[PDB]
């Protein structure tokens, strides 16, 4: 869990 | 989110939208597995409302979103609407979400997890960007 | 409200420093964040406040309330998942 396949960019 | 910024489509795979049968977005939520969504007790969700997963642009028709129905609404009995304390409601999906690249679960902490003041975190949502 | 999903980084505050803005309204199942130039607002409730812990995003708060004007200088208030996770566990096991 908590590990997206499409990485968020901040 | 006032002064927020556009997210990368699909990068917050657990974010769901609670919409009434009119299609009106009224609250956000998070998938903790394929059958349960965690949201705020104040949202006032009913079983006529729909959980939409896999969405990014609410104004698009080409997205492969998942409109899931609610079987039961579980409002924390400790929820105090006058103090807005224990503001959490669990939604059991009558139809389970299909996990993929744009739809997955967020982790829950242990009751003993520590998140220190000063730590930078993130919050996402489709709420007002200007009030 | 906006069509596309928005995001925002913001700092967690101590419940002590938050009581300076909210006094006695800050209860124990509440955690503060923001007052940094961003603010959660109407339509955001129920959504997540996530923190990266050991490589994964974990749910630390749930958008609950805050400034009626969504003032970016007042901290927002979220439901503290750490104080509610045992109920989530209980609910998911009984149902």
């Amino acid at each position: 869990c908590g590990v997206p396949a499409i990485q968020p960019v901040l | 989110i006032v002064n927020g910024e556009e997210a990368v489509p699909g990068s917050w795979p657990w974010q769901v939208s609670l919409q009434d049968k009119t299609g009106f977005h009224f609250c956000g939520g998070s998938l903790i597995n394929e059958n349960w969504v965690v949201t705020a007790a104040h949202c006032g969700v009913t079983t006529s409302d729909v959980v939409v997963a896999g969405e990014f642009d609410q104004g698009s028709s080409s997205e492969k979103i998942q409109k899931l129905k609610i079987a039961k609404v579980f409002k924390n009995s400790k929820y105090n609407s006058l103090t807005i304390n224990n503001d959490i409601t669990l939604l059991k999906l009558s139809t389970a979400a299909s996990f993929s690249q744009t739809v997955s679960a967020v982790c829950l902490p242990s009751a003993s997890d520590d998140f220190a003041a000063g730590t930078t975190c993130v919050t996402t949502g489709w709420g007002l960007t200007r009030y | 409200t906006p069509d596309r999903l928005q995001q925002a980084s913001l700092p967690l505050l101590s419940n002590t420093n938050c009581k300076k803005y909210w006094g006695t309204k800050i209860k124990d199942a509440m955690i503060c964040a923001g007052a940094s130039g961003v603010s959660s607002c109407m339509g955001d409730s129920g959504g997540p406040l996530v923190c990266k812990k050991n490589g994964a995003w974990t749910l630390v708060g749930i958008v609950s309330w805050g400034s009626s004007t969504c003032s970016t200088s007042t901290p927002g208030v979220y439901a503290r998942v750490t104080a509610l996770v045992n109920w989530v566990q209980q609910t998911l096991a009984a149902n």
Side-chain angles (χ1 to χ4, degrees):
Chain A
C1 58
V3 310
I6 303 180
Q7 253 53 246
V9 170
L10 306 167
Chain B
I1 296 188
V2 175
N3 261 265
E5 58 172 350
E6 208 171 273
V8 165
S11 47
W12 300 115
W14 43 83
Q15 173 85 48
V16 303
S17 176
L18 301 176
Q19 299 176 9
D20 59 29
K21 61 175 166 280
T22 269
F24 174 80
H25 165 90
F26 62 83
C27 275
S30 299
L31 280 165
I32 52 176
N33 61 216
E34 44 272 282
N35 281 288
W36 290 89
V37 180
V38 279
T39 188
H42 79 255
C43 290
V45 175
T46 63
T47 43
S48 312
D49 294 315
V50 64
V51 167
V52 191
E55 186 169 61
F56 165 70
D57 185 339
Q58 304 201 134
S60 174
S61 59
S62 53
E63 291 183 353
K64 169 213 47 172
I65 63 174
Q66 294 178 35
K67 299 166 202 166
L68 315 159
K69 300 157 195 49
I70 297 161
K72 179 62 179 163
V73 186
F74 298 85
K75 179 161 71 178
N76 199 318
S77 64
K78 321 298 165 189
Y79 171 57
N80 179 319
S81 50
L82 266 75
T83 59
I84 321 296
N85 193 218
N86 296 287
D87 195 1
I88 185 180
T89 271
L90 267 169
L91 303 180
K92 182 191 177 69
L93 304 182
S94 67
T95 177
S98 195
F99 285 2
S100 59
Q101 273 190 311
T102 56
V103 183
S104 45
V106 69
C107 297
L108 289 169
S110 281
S112 76
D113 272 4
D114 175 58
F115 297 101
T119 304
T120 293
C121 300
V122 184
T123 184
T124 46
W126 289 273
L128 300 183
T129 50
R130 164 169 274 238
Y131 181 93
Chain C
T1 52
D3 271 352
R4 288 102 104 62
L5 183 65
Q6 308 290 301
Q7 70 186 19
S9 307
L10 64 179
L12 298 178
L13 304 191
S14 44
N15 257 217
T16 251
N17 179 57
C18 189
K19 279 207 179 69
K20 285 178 69 173
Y21 296 87
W22 302 116
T24 68
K25 295 181 179 76
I26 301 317
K27 291 298 181 279
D28 271 29
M30 302 185 187
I31 186 175
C32 300
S36 56
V38 304
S39 182
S40 282
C41 197
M42 293 134 187
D44 282 316
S45 298
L49 167 68
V50 293
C51 307
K52 197 164 170 289
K53 192 65 172 302
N54 287 318
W57 295 95
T58 122
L59 197 62
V60 177
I62 299 179
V63 186
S64 184
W65 59 278
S67 181
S68 65
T69 145
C70 304
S71 178
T72 71
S73 68
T74 317
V77 191
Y78 304 73
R80 187 184 289 268
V81 180
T82 220
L84 304 166
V85 70
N86 285 146
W87 169 82
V88 177
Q89 234 71 128
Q90 226 74 177
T91 301
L92 263 49
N95 305 274

